[PDB]
Homo-oligomer: 71 residues x 7
Amino acid sequence: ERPLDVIHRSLDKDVLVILKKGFEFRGRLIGYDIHLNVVLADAEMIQDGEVVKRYGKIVIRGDNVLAISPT
Amino acid sequence: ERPLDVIHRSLDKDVLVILKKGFEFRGRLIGYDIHLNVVLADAEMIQDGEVVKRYGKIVIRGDNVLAISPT
Amino acid sequence: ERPLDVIHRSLDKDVLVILKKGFEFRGRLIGYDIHLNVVLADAEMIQDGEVVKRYGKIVIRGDNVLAISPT
Amino acid sequence: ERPLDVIHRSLDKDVLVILKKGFEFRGRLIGYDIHLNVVLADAEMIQDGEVVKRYGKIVIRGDNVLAISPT
Amino acid sequence: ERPLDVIHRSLDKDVLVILKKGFEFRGRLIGYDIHLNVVLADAEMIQDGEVVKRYGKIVIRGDNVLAISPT
Amino acid sequence: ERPLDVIHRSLDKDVLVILKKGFEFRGRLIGYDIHLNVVLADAEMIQDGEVVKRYGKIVIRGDNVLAISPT
Amino acid sequence: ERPLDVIHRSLDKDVLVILKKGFEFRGRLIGYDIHLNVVLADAEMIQDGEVVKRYGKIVIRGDNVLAISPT
């Protein structure tokens, strides 16, 4: 039920990573660490519902993260 | 009585998570950790009084939190 | 005379929690921890000298706190 | 003379606590901790040399402090 | 694949380092540390899609990094 | 010449403390600590080149400092 | 070539220190510490490509640094 528990079971699952600034990243979670830094495969940066960029793989730093939700 | 006791007593209960933006989340509290990162189930993001997003489950990082209130 | 001493003496007493914003919370202090996260019961959120919201119980994170004054 | 030495020497004396705002608190220093959180007695919040609020006692968090000057 | 595994695997490979302020750096990853500070060789600062500077080598601090993507 | 070595040697001497706020402090360095908090005597707060405030003694928190230059 | 190795090798060499507001410092690196605080000799503060100030010696706190590049 804890924050890390949820992230753990989202491995290989699609997730939404909400950033503090105002945009988001969506992709398949393939890794993470205790600081909540995360690694996404086949990711897309989203802004106002529009897919702006895509990455084969991206490591996001948890300090910028507002929230993470298994979609 | 302490911050963590209150959060612990609110498991499985509706709570309000106020962010440093007059921006908030409301949902059922299902998990948390010592950094005050929290996990809500059946959540909704509220902006200026209205629902702008919904999540089956969402992990919110405590560093962005202003306050949490059991509802 | 130390910060935590003053906070401890304020338990079950009315306090003012000033945030950086012109915003503040006023309520009965019922708990706290070493990081200055505090719990208020029968609380009010004040914006520019006016009550904009009320809460039965609220946990406020010390990281957003400018000062706390026992009333 | 170390920052901590100066603060210690200002106990029970009047001091100016400058905030990263243009705002400041002025009052009698009655306590402090290693993080530079400080407690003031018979304190006032000042803006451009004018009193905007008064406090019998107030705990100010060091994280928001720019500087402290004993007067 | 944990964050550090991906970064390690990217040594001598091309990477995109996105900073919290809209701009990015691109170059060959030649070094890094546990804080996610990174060293890029033959790097390019990019703003809105325009290369504005080139560096033989450049050390970027992880505290300002939003994300890192092995291209 | 490590950062701290340069500071220690400026004891009793005139220094310029540049803040990440657009202004600076100038005065005689009479103390400091490992966090780069510093104490200045006969200090002058300078803004846009003009002295806008003067202090007999002032403790400046290092977290708001951009740089320190021994004049 | 981790971050610190690169900085070490730049001792007594010209370096560019990029800051967060379109500001930068250029000078000869003569000292540094593990926090990436750095000391520069014969330094210039540059704003949007224009030299606005000069310092015989200056200690720059690493917390404000975005990047460092040996010239």
